[PDB]
Design an enzyme around this catalytic site. Structure first.
Site, PDB file in Angstrom:
ATOM      1  N   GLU B 377      38.695  20.184  21.362  1.00  0.00           N
ATOM      2  CA  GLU B 377      37.321  20.053  20.886  1.00  0.00           C
ATOM      3  C   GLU B 377      36.445  21.170  21.441  1.00  0.00           C
ATOM      4  O   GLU B 377      36.496  21.478  22.636  1.00  0.00           O
ATOM      5  CB  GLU B 377      36.764  18.687  21.283  1.00  0.00           C
ATOM      6  CG  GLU B 377      37.524  17.524  20.661  1.00  0.00           C
ATOM      7  CD  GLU B 377      37.226  16.198  21.327  1.00  0.00           C
ATOM      8  OE1 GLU B 377      36.643  16.203  22.433  1.00  0.00           O
ATOM      9  OE2 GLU B 377      37.575  15.149  20.744  1.00  0.00           O
ATOM     10  N   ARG B 393      37.065  22.460  25.147  1.00  0.00           N
ATOM     11  CA  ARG B 393      37.818  21.511  25.957  1.00  0.00           C
ATOM     12  C   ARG B 393      39.224  22.050  26.189  1.00  0.00           C
ATOM     13  O   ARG B 393      39.937  22.378  25.235  1.00  0.00           O
ATOM     14  CB  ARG B 393      37.861  20.162  25.242  1.00  0.00           C
ATOM     15  CG  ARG B 393      38.796  19.116  25.826  1.00  0.00           C
ATOM     16  CD  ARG B 393      38.645  17.816  25.041  1.00  0.00           C
ATOM     17  NE  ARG B 393      39.642  16.805  25.379  1.00  0.00           N
ATOM     18  CZ  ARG B 393      39.530  15.516  25.070  1.00  0.00           C
ATOM     19  NH1 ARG B 393      38.459  15.076  24.421  1.00  0.00           N
ATOM     20  NH2 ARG B 393      40.485  14.663  25.415  1.00  0.00           N
ATOM     21  N   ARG B 457      34.515   9.611  33.031  1.00  0.00           N
ATOM     22  CA  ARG B 457      33.452   9.956  32.092  1.00  0.00           C
ATOM     23  C   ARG B 457      32.187   9.223  32.531  1.00  0.00           C
ATOM     24  O   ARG B 457      31.901   8.111  32.086  1.00  0.00           O
ATOM     25  CB  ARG B 457      33.869   9.621  30.669  1.00  0.00           C
ATOM     26  CG  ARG B 457      35.109  10.396  30.252  1.00  0.00           C
ATOM     27  CD  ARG B 457      35.396  10.306  28.771  1.00  0.00           C
ATOM     28  NE  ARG B 457      36.558  11.116  28.415  1.00  0.00           N
ATOM     29  CZ  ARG B 457      37.118  11.139  27.211  1.00  0.00           C
ATOM     30  NH1 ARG B 457      36.626  10.390  26.233  1.00  0.00           N
ATOM     31  NH2 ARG B 457      38.173  11.909  26.986  1.00  0.00           N
TER      32      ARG B 457
END
Lengths: 522, 522
Positions: B377, B393, B457
């Protein structure tokens, strides 16, 4: 020509469900372009007037890396866990291609489905009428499958003479605002009333500690219809702690046959944050340290229930981490003694199963010695007058442990069937005794239910023994649910000729089925 | 004596929520009997008229094996994942002890809570008025805590001068019958309209393949209110396969600034059973073998959307397993070129990131060469006229890979910041360029958002660079969400003075917040 592979299911057909998976079909279309029709023929003894519809669904194809793994579906077609969406097939997974309402014995399902150049999945759905009988048995065969205007070759991988049995989803995920229901218990009162108890796990399926009540479903028509849920045990915000830190679970229910008083015992856990009570209950005796053993009784056939009775101090040794009933049911002995199976984690943090009894109609209770080390959930049955047989979940794995006692648990004797006759994946199991005087066969029989496996919780099976549990002959067994579930179950005699089972099935959190005694023992 | 330990939160305060966790309190009552009251003072610059209520909750105790681990709560108080139950605190976990509606700057919350002989958890809830402003900032201090009619010692483990920012839960779990929403994209049209796109994952949060549509939320008041959901891309039962085998996801949106035409690109997956498309898309070009790259356009400022335009044949090499856009947004270059970041799994099954561009207003598209191997990504921004910077990414882990190109992807140059300046846990990240001409600072700035970590995250952070991405000074950063979430985000400029972000937060599947440019660059 391509071969259409067929796998007939062996799972309960819930009467209230809008869909039930009856057949799965797989077709790898190397030369096929359209599937035109599937013809289904019900057995000659099937009561068609109790069947509402038959449907043919198309469910698409398979991931190319999964070709040749012998799957018969790409996904589960009907959820038993999504709140409020457990009655009909998920429309995103299955397209209704044809439907026949009020079908005849012969049913033609015209699909006219363009086939994916590869694997293609179809399945047949059976929908009963809401008033269908619990003892209705459905048999059927796929007579023909038309592909590209020709009869296609069929190969059926499932066995012949499958009997499809119906059942009742007493509790579905999401009912009455609860995410899940677990841990069944089931008894029949002296009036013929069926009483089923279970955990009401509101937030999710997690064990205690959590927001959990004991729920109860009552049926006065042999399990066909069930009354609005009751809550015999619920502690809410007791002690000014949140409801999620006042759960009560793992119920066990028994009927005092001398008076018809009904008793429910459960484990009330207070505090313990949001962790598991198995590792959060500690030595002591008060609510702030250890789980509490509470009772509720009913003197009106299960309609109303007394406030909880805390019997922890009668039977718990302070050194134990955790004392709780064995989930399921208890019994009334021939001499009037009430007995509940129990389990306690001793000072070494090892669990042991045993029994709890009362000789004064439930006023006072006593525990003596454990039956076997490193055992947990157990059920007890009076195999012979004065002889109690304890059937135990054994952490050693692979098979149930069985012991008997003639002195209400002071001393125990290992049974010949112990760790040999009854395999288990380490899971709750039900055992009951039915005396010749109370069944049409006029013989003393033991009935047992659990997942008939050593791995996984599937193939829920009722087994019968005619020799006090020494042998469990294969021809005296009924396999009710081949699918995977949580595996717990509880048995009772609905009447002298009919068995009742309430269990966690692959089709509903609390599934009830009726099985004729002459179906299992032929 | 006993000390009340306090931890102030740093998470978005959702305007539409009935509860928001502001403070957590822990009290180990070794000598305390009752907690009487908590007094908190809001900051002098807080607009109290935008606050609806303040509440004090009691949440019980902790499992004894968890004592001394410095936990400030026994459980998550407010779910962001339970469908239809994400707006208010779970009442089974927290008891409302006191509530002040329309509070003044000083608030007295009288609890009168008898304390458990052990750990006790409390927390303070903040509720905004539904029409509160997105630029509202809330500060507060706990002035005193009364225990047993005495002021108790307080110890605050969280830092001083925390700024609480509000936000809007554009999508909550369960909204419009969808279990979850994922993969945000966000742009601002030439009319100032905000357009946010995302996966609509109906059955669950699983990636493709599954029942997934591209959804869109449109706001004409700077993100304060959002119009009812639109569906720019949805394929239903295309090809006569079930909807769950026709998902479209990972959307990316861009505005053609020369015409205000809006474009959405996504990956339509056909077939593949119920498996992940990342491992089920294979070489080829048609829907039956490989994922399709589809477009939808809007010529009325995002109100209505065209039928899908399949551009797979324009840009996909047959040998690739999987070609799809880079989720988030694209750009219009100064010279009018439309650019979407892309990613493709090559014949060796290794993914590589790149860009696709169109020079004829979106009619035809081209891809040249990948920027870097083993990347997925990415987002692209024109840092200088004719210079495209791709922020990727990187499966190598630990940090973003950054490269630039002067020839639309024919040749690539590693940037000085590559694998150095921006740490990541291997996750989607947003990058945009704002020219001096288009912001109040009158300087060219780059803005970047991702989870500011190497593992997990959490701590979603916006970062700004004033030198074309060579340096990202720590003082030019805003940490918006310390909680755990799915981590994806996308940035845009609401106007010349305000940044907008749509991201997967710990409080809502699609969270929108506004951040003034002079808050991040002071």
């Amino acid at each position: 020509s391509d071969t259409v592979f067929v796998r007939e299911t062996q799972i309960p057909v819930l009467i209230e469900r809008q869909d039930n998976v009856l057949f799965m079909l797989r077709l790898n279309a190397k030369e096929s372009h359209t599937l035109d029709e599937v013809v289904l023929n019900f057995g000659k003894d099937v009561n068609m007037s109790d069947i509402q519809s038959v449907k043919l669904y198309y469910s698409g194809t398979e991931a190319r890396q999964n070709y040749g793994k012998n799957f018969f579906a790409p996904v589960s077609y009907i959820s038993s866990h999504t709140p409020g969406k457990t009655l009909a097939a998920n429309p995103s997974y299955s397209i209704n291609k044809s439907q026949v309402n009020n079908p005849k014995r012969k049913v033609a399902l015209k699909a006219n489905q363009k086939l994916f150049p590869g694997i293609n999945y179809f399945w047949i759905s059976l929908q009963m009428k809401p008033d269908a009988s619990l003892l209705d048995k459905v048999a059927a065969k796929i007579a023909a499958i038309k592909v590209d205007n020709k009869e296609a070759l069929m190969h059926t991988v499932s066995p012949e003479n499958i009997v499809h049995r119906v059942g009742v989803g007493v509790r579905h995920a999401g009912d009455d605002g609860s995410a899940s229901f677990r841990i069944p218990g089931l008894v029949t009162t002296n009036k013929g009333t069926l009483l089923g108890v279970y955990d009401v796990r509101y937030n999710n399926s997690a064990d205690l500690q959590e927001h959990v009540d004991i729920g109860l479903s009552r049926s006065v028509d042999g399990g066909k219809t069930w009354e609005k849920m009751r809550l015999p045990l619920a502690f809410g915000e007791t002690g000014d702690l949140p409801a999620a830190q006042n759960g009560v679970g793992d119920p066990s229910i028994l009927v005092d046959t001398k008076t018809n008083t009904v008793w429910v015992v459960a484990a009330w856990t207070h505090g313990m944050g949001n962790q598991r009570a198995w590792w959060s209950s500690y030595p002591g005796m008060d609510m702030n340290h250890t789980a509490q053993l509470v009772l509720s009784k009913s003197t009106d056939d299960g309609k109303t229930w007394s406030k909880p009775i805390n019997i922890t101090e009668q039977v718990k040794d302070p050194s134990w981490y955790f004392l709780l009933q064995g989930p399921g049911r208890g019994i009334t002995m021939q001499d009037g003694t009430l007995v509940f199976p129990i389990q306690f984690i001793d000072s070494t943090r090892v669990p042991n199963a045993g029994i709890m009894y009362s000789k004064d109609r439930g006023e006072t209770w006593k525990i003596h010695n454990y039956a076997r080390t490193n055992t947990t959930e157990a059920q007890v049955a009076e195999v012979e007058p004065g002889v109690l047989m304890l059937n135990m979940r054994d952490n050693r794995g692979g098979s149930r442990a069985i012991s008997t006692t003639k002195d209400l648990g002071k001393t125990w004797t290992e049974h010949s069937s112990s760790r040999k006759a009854l395999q288990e994946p380490v899971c709750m199991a039900s055992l009951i005794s039915v005396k010749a005087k109370d069944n049409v066969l006029n013989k003393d029989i033991l009935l047992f239910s659990n997942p008939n496996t050593v791995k996984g919780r599937h193939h829920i099976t009722i087994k019968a023994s005619l020799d006090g549990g020494v042998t469990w002959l294969p021809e005296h067994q009924v396999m009710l649910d081949e699918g995977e579930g949580w595996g717990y179950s509880c048995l009772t005699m609905i009447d002298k000729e009919t068995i009742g089972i309430l269990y966690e099935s692959s089709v509903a959190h609390m599934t009830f089925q009726a099985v004729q005694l002459r179906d299992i023992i032929k």
